[PDB]
Design a protein around this nucleic acid. Sequence first.
DNA 1: TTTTGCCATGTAATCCCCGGA
DNA 2: ATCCGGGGATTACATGGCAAA
Lengths: 58, 56
Amino acid sequence: KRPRTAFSSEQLARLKREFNENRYLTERRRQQLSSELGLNEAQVKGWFKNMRAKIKKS
Amino acid sequence: RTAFSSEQLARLKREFNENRYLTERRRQQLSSELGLNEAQVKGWFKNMRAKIKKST
DNA sequence: TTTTGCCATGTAATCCCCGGA
DNA sequence: ATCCGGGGATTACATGGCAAA
């Protein structure tokens, strides 16, 4: 099982800025964003997945 | 890669005609009766629905 | 026709998407 | 983060069927 991580405030600000433009990730955009933030792609994919579900519930 | 016998395919097809989606129960029961693993029966149903959509 | 021998098609399986729990 | 249980897109590969001397 993949470890849970905590995102820094800079990572969360960049993620959210991104989610504000498009709630879905293409492959290239995921790679770029994971590389830029120093995050595993699975963590990024996961954050977007959970954020869609939180905002759908909100 | 497994190849299903004509008897298995005949039964799978008749089951598919009656209900194109398996319940857990029916998947278990079908697999037991046919001598197949549940993943193979589940995969057959998945591929059958895809194949049909891919026609129209 | 035979007897190869390649390739096209079929399909079981894999990969990855998604929402929901 | 996990897993399930859909989907679409492919991929690997067995084999049927055609090609050809």
